[PDB]
């Protein structure tokens, strides 16, 4: 079962709301949707990417040079620019 | 106004109720009644309203006007055009022309109504239409211009014409307003009717124009069609060369047109977009065919097809132009006399003379190849003798392009020898001619050494120049000189 | 030392020594970081309703008009039908403003970094103007608007007229004019802030200098300054300080390791990862998942 | 399986019709989104052996204007590509009289055949895509964000506004995917357009190196 | 002479006055005389039906839409300033009329908008709806109640609707009813006095005082001191002082030891009062508080005196022959004070090796009712504090176990047990594991089942369906419900359990339920009996 | 991080909040003691908030002669209920945890590091933006 180059696999729900699913109601009010999310401990993307019922559009990673093999430079811009604020806003502090 | 069946009554009691007693109740009572509203409402207004106008429900009218209207949408586009629902708009466009002097009844003959056997003559019978005319434009104004009214908004094309000769000096959406309401048979009438007349009279702007109004046919709304698939290269590509072999031999595989290849090379033929297009076309395929020093072969059928396109609309049933196989080596014997001076040059003239003086298209090619010092100072007087063999009308246009391919070259003696073939020929130059001349002479005076002179010769052409727009440009030209 | 000559020039563009451009203006915006604040976009996250009831203007009320507004100024709104059209427009404005905020920020916040503080400023003007606002204001809102607009007019990251500039000014000042529009709207000037005509003019004037004062300087070494804001953050974090997950906790690693392994590309990092969100039904059934 | 591969084969028949949309061709509005059902209904629900084998889907477009330049989509039975394979598409290719195709290769291409490749280039342009490829149309994935290929004349007008080169953009690769599902050369300007959290909108450029 | 009219001629009455006696300037009067300068549109508006035949929607919703704009118009042009005197001057033709025809929202809307002024109009449209046969109906407005021949027909016709309706309409009418009756305290003087009288019958008041009961509730929820207006409806203060102890500490709302030792002392004397004085529920809850806290410690000194008051309330009978007791008894209170001293002593020890211990003692408490509702009580306020799930046995059902035992003995505590259920089901616990929360939700729903296995069945699958439809939890757990559900239960099927439980299992997840089970059919065999039930599933 | 990097250092800022309480009041000799350090004040003794029996100035009166200009902030003390701005007293808060600093004058509210620290929007941050900063180096002196 599954692909190669991967170790077990945790899921979860999110508690904040970089995970959680937020959507627009049609009064148009925010509201966060709390879904099931996985989270790997090995990297595959345009293999996880191709199964079912998996997200094609939020479904990010955590290596960026698996990103810039399959999703470009710009979009390895934007990973390591969300990683990078991870990093630096984990224990919260500021960076602009 | 207008008088309806209910409008009949009303004026009916509008004079029996100016004399004869009848007490406001039974006035009141055969005057009129709202058969919809509550009796308890229309109490309830004098003791709410203090004598209100009911016309907000006419408001709500307005909103039926568009919303059975949405529904009439809805009687359209669910059914797929319902016989029965749109006899009941026709019946109901009767209803409201007859009672409206006709917004309502506006937008229900915009929805739809087509095949309405006396829609048009209803039209007619309200013939004044001044504002109509633009609002009943979805399915009403078709066909009821075509006899007078197309004609009358002809001139607009010709006052567009006139802008962009005045805006070259220094459209897109009104023909989709035009081609909101526009069908094959009236666009086909339009179309010929405006070649023919085009094609007797000038035979010079209109041609692009109609080109581009092919070209905004965009919107899937359906010989012509290979017109536009094959003008598509046409309008894409500037220097579009093997497409355009592919299209010379499409359209040299034709068959016995009966004026079909006659429009197509009408239509190809007077464009300065589609000319300047197959003149650089042309000019680059034969740089390409010097590059392989194999010169004649597909320039030669490029240069034939855009003489027959230069060619067409002298006379009606043609085929084409002759090809002149021996002409075109002695036609193109000077571009080779200009690549060896280049060539000696970057390590002749009165061969450039006797075949400059000898003399469509290959005057055109040989004004386009003057783009691309001791080559261009040597055949300048070949130059000098075109400008004093043939002096058409264009060559100002060609001098122009000359004046932009050295405005990008930016040199002080090519300048000055395009300022003396300027000068030289102001004897019979057009308005725009001279205006050109004095937009360039505007880029001129890089020299301090004849620039004076030539402000002294701006005003030594300002009395030689009678035409008043020649001289207010002098005059803003050397306002803006001064600045 | 990877950017230690990467500047601002004088086309208010970000260069690095060889004139190759890393940034079209600064930050995106051309903003420096200093005289910018944390402020909260109004027009992101209420209701449909509650945006329409806090932002529209509805000018048919009499009564209203006559609480917030001077008799000849409401006059002056019921009597013209321009007028009702050009709130109508600055309403349609704010409703393309929501959506185009919708699409900026999928998430559900709006602490937003933007340099002029415009509730501070307003609540500026109310002080020094003495404003009393339990009185009827004097401003006419059509003056509010079309000094938002002459305002926004003023406010120039990048010169010029042709097109691409046109385009480039305006997505430099998209979000901040956003906020200015939402800020200094008509509704909330005449409901529930009810400056003054002198006070809204200083209003203005204030807006237009602090934001031109935030424009990043050319000659500023953006280089250093960004790589030493990074450094200095990285000795105050810690590997070991976070308490940790006893459950499973994907030996995220977060800290000094990290931020080397996204410093040096690393092709073997120490924990990588994916986030796997499910598509449909199955994000909402554990069995699926 | 059957069913997976009729999957397969529909998810890959619809990110090439969803690139031919991007890249600027005419691509029918049903087709550019059609249902699996459909899909199976129009080809045969039986790729093992069967119906929608490859090369009955071979996908032929043109472009939206100058409707004379195609890519008409190849798809090739084999996994493995060779020479011998892709001359019988250059067989194809100089039957008809345009110059760039796609193919779509299962397993990776023998290298000999990669070099094949570009040793047509000038004369006729081919693109290749491996299934894992095209089983995302990355394009939709939230971290890309919006590329739209510029014109030479707005190349011009870009270089002449900001007084700067081609040399001085900052750049992007050949084998950049969303650059090759674009099918870009080199030397032709990406606008690219991202939210920012600062500004709102920034439009980036990348030249191609 | 005028002859200037288009469509004027229906304002035909003001015109003629001023037609006849003109005079002077007449400018105005002929301006208004042709101030109708449309055509005749008040027919074309009739013709506006007309064209809707040939429209979408040649129905009575465009005549509906008429009205709709002419009471919007009505409105919005609402004469304000003289309301009051164009209801006291006309007022026979027209509100009489328009309350025949057009009473369904406009006066109402009307006496919701000012209310204050027009009690003219106010008067004829209270009265013309007292003349509509169902009542009242039409003024239903929380404001538009302060008359009293409006306010005591509305609260008739709502008592009507809520007797009629049952348990099941108890929760959805009584906000509904108590926002009227809980708006004005004279109101609720009125009310409270009606439930007195309609619940001095044994034939039937329960009910009555059941719904006194949770109007003096939301009494005591909204801000309400009613418990002196409850203690003088009372037959309570025939005997003064213990009434008077319970009213001031009713209005303290807590417990006073030594006013607890006032009634006391009159109490388990050879004059008792009235048992109906301490059956008051308010103070038995007062009574969980102050004594199954898991806090709140009780000084060890007047606690017997509490366990002996509780018993007494919860024990004795009495015989009322003609308002006179002759046969009490206290022959059971001894039991039922050792089970409170017992259960008491298990809630004040707070040692959890020895909650699982003395468990079967426990297990024999639970058969007493007020036993059961203390537990109840003392799990709801020990369970629902957060982060207590970090002790883990089997993610500690041993609570929960009380739970199953609080259902089984009893079955009047099954709402306030589906309350908590569903309270700790919608609670979402923080620092939990997610595989773990989601095994404690797998425990609750077994709960859920026990209480769906003792009959209490329709509240339960009524919020199943409501947190599959409305705001939805996780898809497993629901799936879960059925698989243990249908695990247990065999055909008969009673119609309603068959229509309420139907939607959630055949929309939304059909193929989850069926995995391994084989030895007894899944779901197949609903759904063949759910064929074979209705008509066709209809 | 577009905030300020001095702040109020430790011992100066428990003097403070110890300062800015509710309950603290000063002498007229130990105000004219303190009103010798301020540098940016212009000569005029304020108006006591305790005129009789005893002339008593509140420490927030001196604090609000060191606050320059006329700056308006709102900032919340570090042991303010969030329970508080819920019901009523949120504009008299009970607890005097609501600092409001207006046109310049300290009205209410206890200064912790969350209004004079380095927190960005504190005091001093605004001070620094809506005054100049030569006005902010005073500042600082006089409250140390």
Not at chain 2, 161 to 187: D, H, P
Not at chain 5, 393 to 405: F, G, I, K, Y
Not at chain 6, 15 to 30: H, Q, S, Y
Request: one cysteine or more; charged letters at 25%.
């Amino acid at each position: 079962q599954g692909i190669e180059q991967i170790s077990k696999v945790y899921m979860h729900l999110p508690q904040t709301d970089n995970k959680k699913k937020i959507i627009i109601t049609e009064d148009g009010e925010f509201k966060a949707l709390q879904e099931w999310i996985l989270e790997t401990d090995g990297v595959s993307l345009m293999r996880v990417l191709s199964e079912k019922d998996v997200d094609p559009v939020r479904t990010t990673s955590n290596d960026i040079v698996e990103i810039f093999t399959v999703l470009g430079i710009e979009a390895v811009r934007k990973a390591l620019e969300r990683e990078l604020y991870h990093v630096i806003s984990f224990d919260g502090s500021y960076v602009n | 106004x207008x008088x309806x069946x209910x409008x009949x009554x009303x004026x009916x009691x509008x004079x029996x109720x100016x004399x004869x007693x009848x007490x406001x109740x039974x006035x009141x009572x055969x005057x009129x009644x709202x058969x919809x509203x509550x009796p308890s409402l229309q109490s309830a207004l004098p003791f709410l309203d203090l004598h209100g106008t009911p016309r907000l429900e006419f408001h709500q009218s307005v909103f039926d006007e568009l919303r059975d209207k949405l529904l009439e949408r809805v009687s359209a586009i669910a059914s797929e055009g319902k016989a029965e629902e749109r006899y009941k708009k026709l019946e109901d466009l009767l209803e409201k022309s007859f009672s409206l002097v006709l917004q309502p009844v506006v937008m229900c003959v915009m929805k739809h109504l087509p095949k309405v056997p006396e829609k048009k003559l209803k039209l007619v019978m309200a013939d004044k239409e001044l504002y109509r005319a633009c609002a009943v434009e979805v399915k009403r104004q078709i066909w009821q211009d075509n006899q007078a009214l197309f004609g009358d908004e002809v001139s607009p094309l010709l006052k567009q014409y006139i802008l962009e000769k005045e805006s070259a000096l220094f459209e897109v959406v009104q023909r989709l307003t035009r081609m909101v309401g526009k069908n094959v048979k009236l666009y086909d009438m339009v179309l010929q009717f405006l070649r023919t007349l085009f094609l007797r009279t000038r035979n010079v702007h209109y041609c692009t124009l109609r080109a581009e109004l092919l070209m905004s046919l965009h919107d899937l709304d359906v010989c012509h069609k290979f017109t536009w698939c094959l003008d598509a290269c046409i309008r894409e590509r500037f220097v579009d060369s093997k497409r355009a072999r592919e299209l010379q031999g499409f359209l040299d595989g034709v068959k016995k047109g009966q004026e079909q290849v006659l429009g197509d090379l009408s239509m190809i033929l007077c464009d300065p977009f589609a000319i300047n297009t197959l003149a650089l076309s042309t000019v680059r395929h034969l740089q390409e065919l010097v590059g392989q020093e194999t010169l004649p072969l597909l320039l030669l059928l490029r240069l034939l097809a855009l003489g027959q396109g230069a060619w067409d609309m002298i006379d009606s049933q043609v085929f084409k132009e002759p090809k002149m196989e021996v002409e075109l080596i002695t036609r193109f014997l000077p571009m080779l006399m200009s690549f060896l001076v280049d060539d000696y040059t970057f390590n002749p003239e009165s061969f450039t003379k006797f075949l400059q003086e000898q003399r469509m298209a290959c005057e055109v090619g040989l004004y386009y190849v003057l783009h691309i010092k001791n080559a261009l100072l040597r055949l300048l007087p070949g130059l000098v003798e075109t400008f004093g063999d043939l002096a058409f009308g264009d060559i100002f246009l060609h001098l122009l392009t000359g004046n932009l391919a050295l405005l990008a070259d930016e040199f002080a003696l090519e300048d000055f020898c395009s300022s003396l073939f300027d000068g030289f020929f102001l004897t019979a130059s057009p308005r725009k001619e001279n205006v050109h001349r004095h937009a360039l002479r505007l880029l001129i005076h890089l020299h301090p050494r004849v620039a004076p002179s030539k402000l002294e010769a701006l005003q030594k052409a300002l009395e030689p120049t009678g035409q008043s727009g020649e001289a207010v440009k002098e005059l803003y030209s050397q306002l803006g000189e001064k600045l | 030392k990877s950017m230690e000559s990467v500047m601002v020039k004088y086309d208010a563009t970000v260069r690095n020594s060889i004139n190759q451009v890393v940034q079209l203006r600064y930050g995106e915006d051309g903003l420096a970081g200093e005289s910018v604040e944390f402020q909260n976009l109004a027009t992101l996250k209420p209701s449909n309703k509650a945006f329409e009831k806090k932002f529209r203007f509805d000018y048919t009320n009499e009564r209203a008009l006559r609480r917030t507004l001077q008799e000849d100024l409401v006059k002056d709104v019921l009597s013209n039908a321009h007028i009702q059209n050009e709130l109508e427009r600055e309403f349609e404005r704010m409703r393309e403003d929501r959506e185009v905020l919708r699409v900026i920020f999928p998430t559900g916040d709006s602490k937003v970094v933007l340099p002029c503080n415009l509730l501070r400023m307003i609540w500026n003007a109310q002080k020094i103007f003495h404003i009393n606002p339990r009185l009827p204001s004097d401003l006419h809102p059509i003056k509010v608007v079309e000094g938002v607009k002459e305002l926004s007019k003023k406010l120039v990251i990048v010169n010029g007229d042709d097109p691409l500039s046109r385009q480039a000014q305006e997505n430099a000042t998209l979000l901040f004019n956003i906020h200015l529009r939402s800020t200094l709207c008509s509704r909330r000037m005449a409901e529930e802030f009810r400056l003054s005509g002198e006070a809204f003019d200083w209003l203005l004037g204030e807006i237009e200098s602090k934001f031109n004062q935030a424009i990043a300087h050319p000659g500023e070494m953006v280089g250093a300054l960004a790589a030493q804001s990074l450094g200095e953050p990285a000795t105050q974090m810690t590997l070991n300080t976070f308490h940790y997950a006893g459950v499973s906790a994907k030996n995220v690693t977060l800290g000094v390791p990290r931020l080397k392994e996204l410093i040096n590309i690393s092709k073997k990092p120490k924990t990588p990862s994916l986030t796997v969100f499910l598509l449909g039904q199955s994000a909402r059934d554990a069995e699926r998942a | 399986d059957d069913e997976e591969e009729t999957y397969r084969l529909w998810k890959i028949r619809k990110t090439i019709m969803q690139l031919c949309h991007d890249r600027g061709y005419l691509v029918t509005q049903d087709e550019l989104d059609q249902t699996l059902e459909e899909f199976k209904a129009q080809f045969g629900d039986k790729p093992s052996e069967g119906r929608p084998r490859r090369t009955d889907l071979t996908v032929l477009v043109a472009h939206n204007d100058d409707p004379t330049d195609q890519m008409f989509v190849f798809f090739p039975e084999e996994p493995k590509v060779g020479i011998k394979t892709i001359k019988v598409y250059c067989q194809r290719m100089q039957e008809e009289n345009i110059t760039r195709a796609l193919i779509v290769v299962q397993q990776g291409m023998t290298p000999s055949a990669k070099q094949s490749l570009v040793d047509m280039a000038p004369k006729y342009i081919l693109e290749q895509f491996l299934q894992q490829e095209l089983l995302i149309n990355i394009t939709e994935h939230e971290l890309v964000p919006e590329h739209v290929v510029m014109t030479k004349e707005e190349v011009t007008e870009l270089l002449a506004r900001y007084k700067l080169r081609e040399n001085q953009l900052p750049r992007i690769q050949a084998g950049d995917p969303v650059a090759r599902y674009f099918g870009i050369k080199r030397g032709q300007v990406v606008k690219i357009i991202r939210p920012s959290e600062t500004a709102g909108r920034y439009i980036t450029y990348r030249l191609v190196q | 002479x005028x002859x200037x009219x288009x469509x004027x001629x229906x304002x035909x009455x003001x015109x003629x006055x001023x037609x006849x006696x003109x005079x002077x300037x007449x400018x105005x009067x002929x301006x208004x005389x042709x101030x109708x300068x449309x055509x005749x549109x008040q027919t074309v508006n009739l013709l506006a039906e007309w064209l809707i035949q040939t429209g979408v929607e040649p129905v009575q919703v465009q005549e509906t839409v008429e009205n709709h704009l002419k009471s919007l118009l009505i409105k919005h042009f609402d004469p304000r300033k003289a309301d009051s005197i164009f209801t006291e001057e006309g007022e026979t033709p027209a509100w009489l009329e328009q309350m025949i025809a057009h009473t369904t929202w406009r006066d109402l809307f009307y006496k919701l908008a000012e209310a204050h002024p027009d009690c003219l109009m106010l008067n004829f449209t209270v009265k013309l709806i007292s003349d509509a046969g169902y009542q009242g109906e039409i003024t239903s407005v929380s404001t538009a109640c302060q008359q009293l021949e409006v306010f005591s027909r509305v609260l008739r016709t709502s008592l009507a609707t809520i007797l009629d309706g049952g348990e099941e309409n108890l929760e959805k009418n009584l906000p509904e009813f108590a926002k009227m009756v809980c708006h004005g305290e004279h109101t609720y003087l009125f009310a409270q006095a009606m439930m007195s009288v309609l619940a001095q019958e044994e034939q039937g008041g329960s009910a009555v005082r059941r719904i006194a009961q949770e109007v003096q509730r939301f009494a005591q929820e909204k801000g309400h001191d009613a418990s002196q207006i409850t203690l003088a409806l009372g037959t309570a203060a025939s005997y003064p002082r213990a009434c008077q102890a319970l009213g001031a500490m009713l209005s303290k709302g807590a417990l006073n030891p030594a006013d607890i030792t006032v009634l006391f002392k009159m109490f388990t004397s050879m004059d008792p009062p009235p048992v109906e004085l301490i059956r008051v529920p308010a103070f038995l809850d007062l009574f969980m508080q102050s004594l199954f806290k898991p806090g709140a410690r009780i000084n060890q000194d007047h606690k017997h005196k509490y366990i002996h008051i509780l018993a007494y309330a919860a024990s004795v009978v009495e015989t009322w022959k003609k308002n006179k007791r002759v046969s009490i008894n206290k022959d059971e209170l001894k039991s039922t004070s050792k089970a409170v001293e017992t259960v008491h002593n298990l809630c004040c020890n707070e040692n959890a090796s020895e909650l699982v211990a003395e468990l079967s003692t426990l297990y024999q408490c639970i058969r007493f009712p007020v036993v059961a509702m203390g537990v109840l009580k003392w799990v709801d306020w020990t369970v629902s504090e957060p982060r207590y799930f970090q002790l883990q046995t089997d993610h500690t059902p041993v609570h929960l176990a009380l739970l199953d035992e609080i259902s089984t003995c009893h079955q009047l505590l099954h709402p306030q047990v589906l309350q908590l259920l569903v309270k700790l089901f919608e609670t979402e616990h923080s620092q939990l594991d997610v595989m773990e929360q989601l095994e404690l939700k797998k425990t609750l729903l077994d709960r859920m089942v026990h209480l769906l296995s003792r009959g209490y069945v329709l509240p339960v699958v009524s919020y199943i369906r409501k947190c599959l439809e409305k705001l939805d939890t996780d898809i497993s757990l629901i799936r879960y419900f059925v698989t243990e559900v249908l695990d247990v239960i065999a055909p008969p099927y009673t119609s309603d359990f068959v229509q309420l439980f139907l939607p959630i299992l055949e929309n939304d997840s059909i193929a989850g339920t069926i995995k391994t089970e084989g030895e007894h059919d899944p779901v197949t065999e609903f759904i063949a009996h759910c064929k074979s039930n209705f008509i066709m599933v209809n | 991080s577009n905030r300020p990097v001095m702040g109020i250092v430790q011992d100066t800022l428990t003097a403070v909040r110890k300062f800015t309480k509710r309950d603290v009041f000063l002498e007229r000799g130990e105000v004219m003691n303190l009103l010798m350090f301020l540098s940016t004040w212009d000569g005029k003794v304020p108006q006591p908030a305790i005129l009789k029996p005893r002339p008593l100035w509140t420490g927030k009166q001196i604090f609000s002669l060191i606050i320059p200009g006329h700056i308006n902030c709102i900032r919340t003390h570090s042991t303010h209920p969030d329970d508080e701005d819920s019901g009523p007293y949120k504009h008299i808060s009970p607890g005097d945890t609501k600092v409001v600093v207006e046109n310049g004058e300290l009205i209410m509210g206890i200064l912790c590091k969350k209004s004079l620290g380095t927190s960005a929007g504190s005091l001093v941050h605004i001070s620094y933006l809506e005054m100049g900063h030569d006005i902010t180096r005073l500042f600082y002196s006089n409250i140390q």
